[PDB]
Amino acid sequence: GAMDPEFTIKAIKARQIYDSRGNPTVEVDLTTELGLFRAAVPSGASTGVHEALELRDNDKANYHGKSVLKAVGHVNDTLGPELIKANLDVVDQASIDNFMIKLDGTENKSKFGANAILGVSLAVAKAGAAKKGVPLYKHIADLAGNKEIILPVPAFNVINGGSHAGNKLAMQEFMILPTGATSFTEAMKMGSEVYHHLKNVIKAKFGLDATAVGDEGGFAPNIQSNKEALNLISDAIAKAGYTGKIEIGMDVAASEFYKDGQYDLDFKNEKSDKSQWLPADKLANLYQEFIKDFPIVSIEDPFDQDHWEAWSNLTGCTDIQIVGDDLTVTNPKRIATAVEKKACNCLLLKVNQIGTVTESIAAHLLAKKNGWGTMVSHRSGETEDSFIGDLVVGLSTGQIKTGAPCRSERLAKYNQILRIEEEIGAGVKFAGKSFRKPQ
Amino acid sequence: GAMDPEFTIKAIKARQIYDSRGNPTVEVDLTTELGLFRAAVPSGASTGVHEALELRDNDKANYHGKSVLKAVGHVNDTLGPELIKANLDVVDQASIDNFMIKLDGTENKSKFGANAILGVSLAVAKAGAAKKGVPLYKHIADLAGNKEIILPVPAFNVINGGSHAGNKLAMQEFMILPTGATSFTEAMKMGSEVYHHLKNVIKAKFGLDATAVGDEGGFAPNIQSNKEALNLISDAIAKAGYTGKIEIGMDVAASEFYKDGQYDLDFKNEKSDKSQWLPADKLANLYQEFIKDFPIVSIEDPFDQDHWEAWSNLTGCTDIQIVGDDLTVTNPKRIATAVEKKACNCLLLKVNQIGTVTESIAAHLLAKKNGWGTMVSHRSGETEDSFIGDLVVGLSTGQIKTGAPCRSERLAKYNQILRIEEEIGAGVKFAGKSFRKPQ
Ligand SMILES: [Cl-]
Ligand SMILES: [Cl-]
Ligand SMILES: [Co+2]
Ligand SMILES: [Co+2]
């Protein structure tokens, strides 16, 4: 039978679990002499085009093509056994990640799947922290050269539109940021109180059934305009008692209504008035109008993912945060292009878009070195995993978006940051108004 | 400073976290020489009346009265320190639970809170399993005298009504049970596939916004009748390809439309036709009609929580499972009454309704000794905790309801049972058609 090779990693075991939308995803158990370290992989709602490849089975006869048994098989049959034989120090995240990258041998991780590779990468990072004898977020901070831990402002999904709701609302998501809180504990209290006030307002105006939630845990009532959505959020902030301590973020996902070089803010109405479509300059004016009227501090994907001119123009006129998501796709080649063009000033960090801890940190540090902020992000398909809680604390980016304070694939992350806050103790720092650049 | 007393428990630390509805709840870390053991407490949507007391702060100025800092304080200031000093063997769950019960010194755990006591109780059980060197579910099986582990049929919430939705639907919830699956893995596949087919049907008939989810992860479209809801589920099962392998459970929550000794199936219409209200005999006939027309195998709370005659009558005519929830409230005094009256034949097990592992197992064994089944249950406010996954496996009750396959406070439990299935290995047993009495 088996013989123990006395390698640094004792076992690596992948399995199929279910994500928060009820679809299979990958989980990895990595065992060392110090114990078992478990991590699971999130999944986005759709294909990126520039992302590292998420490997699905495409077996039409089972799970409607969405099982991840091939990815799981790659970990158990090849990636895991070869990494174990490599006998690498589990604290050297970079060597292990680069070994995996080279073993896969493709640019987009299309041999094993980014979902096979990332699950190991994340579990390795936990094993390395245990070997160091420090919490995961301190290990991540070391991997990033970060000398001061600072907790993030949470960015809570509250209102949804775009292709993710049947309302008229064109813009995809609206978020609240308690930048005026004095601690992460108080930020969570403020977000949860505003969220419940918003629920009460929606119930009163739209009815009880209008308070069911989407994938992120927020609401999608039958709102007609983006202005109405901002008004609704402002009313909820005012009823909650936090006007002036809550600011607003938007994720426009403008690629989804980019048609014939213009933008269609009524793209869910099939009889849309094509004379009402906005050129990028007119759309930038609308954003600027919302910024004057509402405490909007961050706008994500304001233009199409390849509309570099419009991005550069807007990022140059405004002084708020402009976040690349579909623009940058956690991809250093795209980030380098965005840096050169000054197209945005904040990177959305989705670790499973690139597929290792090491590359994720590198992408963050590339953004940071060029003066950008970083907003750590969930995916729409999440799990009970809380890694990105430690990640945003360890990188001290000052900002994470990982759901409404509703649905425990979202609260798992916020709860983990509360645990970290308690562990750090008195003197723990909270980014607050400096969320774009905490240090 | 501190001095180590060399007691069996090294530390006990409670904290406030957020549940899946965005409300505070209790989490407890218990540390022994073998590590840290963490557990969190669920919370029901409303007050029971017969439940052990969930202690809330009722500070109107913070969290709208729902923080649990007093309960957290009881663990950290009194319950924890006294349990540690008691120096009890962590594998003796009963001694530790009974010590806590006696320390609180009240019938309903109203001094510390059932939410203070349960968090410790659950963490103790994990520490005891580690001391034994066995998985939690094997330790629980030992605590219960269970000699054969058998995995449960999951009961997935799919359709919601009653006071929990704005539809006309009077009955509170409809569930699918893949009793025809041959393994827990296949049961999860079947449930998730049917769930997604149901989503597609609802989107086609009611629109995309009708597919937002409630607390459990299921749907609440504008259904007019209970028959329509059953038809909708049957259509989804048929489109998924599993007719004959999926059965249906109901939770009527009939207490909520018990008015003037009758039952009002249109209780959400303020102009309800009082001549259409059903006496218990007529309501029992309606259930019997649904049982003839649909594969209904389980009905929970078919009558008011104190309507003993109607319960006894229905449980005597029918041969399907009749589940006490509001009737029994995981309370042995109520269970003894239900046993004597033959009012039901299945106990819904909600550990936080009674407040310790030991009392929960006793309530289960009381039901089992009298020929009842046991269905382990989530609460509407859940966490990323997965204890009740191990609990239903360890007791081998054959059935757990812990959500739709949607929202990770629900998938956390199903995922944990998948992990257990993998750990047991080949030959793992699945209750299947014997879910009411696996052994
Ligand atoms: Cl996003
Ligand atoms: Cl229930
Ligand atoms: Co969305
Ligand atoms: Co409900």
Short mmCIF file of C-alpha atoms in Angstrom, two decimals, chain A residues 38-43 118 122 125-126 136-137 140 150-152 155 184 348-353 356-357 360 374-403 409-417 420:
data_model
loop_
_atom_site.label_atom_id
_atom_site.label_comp_id
_atom_site.label_asym_id
_atom_site.label_seq_id
_atom_site.Cartn_x
_atom_site.Cartn_y
_atom_site.Cartn_z
CA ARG A 38 -9.96 24.12 3.40
CA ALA A 39 -10.90 26.57 0.65
CA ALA A 40 -13.62 26.83 -2.01
CA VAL A 41 -13.78 28.63 -5.36
CA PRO A 42 -16.42 31.25 -6.30
CA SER A 43 -18.02 31.50 -9.73
CA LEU A 118 -7.16 28.53 -7.24
CA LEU A 122 -5.97 29.43 -1.38
CA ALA A 125 -1.91 30.16 1.77
CA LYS A 126 -3.77 28.98 4.87
CA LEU A 136 -4.00 34.32 7.36
CA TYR A 137 -4.32 38.11 6.93
CA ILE A 140 -1.05 37.78 3.16
CA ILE A 150 -6.14 48.52 8.18
CA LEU A 151 -9.70 47.21 8.00
CA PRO A 152 -11.90 48.05 4.99
CA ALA A 155 -19.57 48.24 0.11
CA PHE A 184 -15.70 48.00 11.18
CA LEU A 348 -11.70 45.37 -8.76
CA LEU A 349 -9.87 42.30 -7.42
CA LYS A 350 -11.55 38.97 -8.28
CA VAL A 351 -9.02 36.25 -7.40
CA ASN A 352 -10.76 33.59 -9.47
CA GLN A 353 -10.44 35.78 -12.59
CA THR A 356 -3.67 32.23 -7.87
CA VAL A 357 -3.04 34.16 -4.67
CA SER A 360 -3.84 38.38 -7.40
CA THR A 374 -8.18 48.21 -4.92
CA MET A 375 -11.67 46.95 -4.10
CA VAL A 376 -11.74 43.26 -3.23
CA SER A 377 -14.81 41.57 -4.71
CA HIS A 378 -17.02 38.53 -4.34
CA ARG A 379 -18.54 36.75 -7.32
CA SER A 380 -22.27 36.31 -7.83
CA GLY A 381 -21.88 32.60 -7.12
CA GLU A 382 -20.26 32.50 -3.68
CA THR A 383 -19.71 29.92 -0.95
CA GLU A 384 -19.40 29.84 2.83
CA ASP A 385 -15.65 30.47 2.19
CA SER A 386 -14.33 33.67 3.84
CA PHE A 387 -10.80 33.94 2.33
CA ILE A 388 -11.38 37.34 0.72
CA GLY A 389 -12.13 38.73 4.17
CA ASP A 390 -8.56 37.93 5.19
CA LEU A 391 -7.35 39.08 1.77
CA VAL A 392 -8.80 42.59 1.97
CA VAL A 393 -7.48 42.98 5.52
CA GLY A 394 -4.05 41.60 4.64
CA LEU A 395 -3.67 43.89 1.63
CA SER A 396 -5.19 46.84 3.55
CA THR A 397 -6.97 47.98 0.40
CA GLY A 398 -9.62 49.78 2.49
CA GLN A 399 -12.67 48.52 0.58
CA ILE A 400 -14.42 45.23 -0.18
CA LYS A 401 -17.70 44.55 -1.93
CA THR A 402 -19.02 41.16 -0.93
CA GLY A 403 -22.81 41.51 -0.80
CA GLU A 409 -22.28 33.55 1.50
CA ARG A 410 -22.04 37.33 1.95
CA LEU A 411 -22.12 37.55 5.76
CA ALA A 412 -19.42 34.84 5.95
CA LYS A 413 -16.96 37.48 4.67
CA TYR A 414 -18.24 40.33 6.83
CA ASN A 415 -18.34 38.02 9.87
CA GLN A 416 -14.74 37.00 9.25
CA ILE A 417 -13.65 40.64 9.19
CA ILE A 420 -10.23 39.74 12.58
#
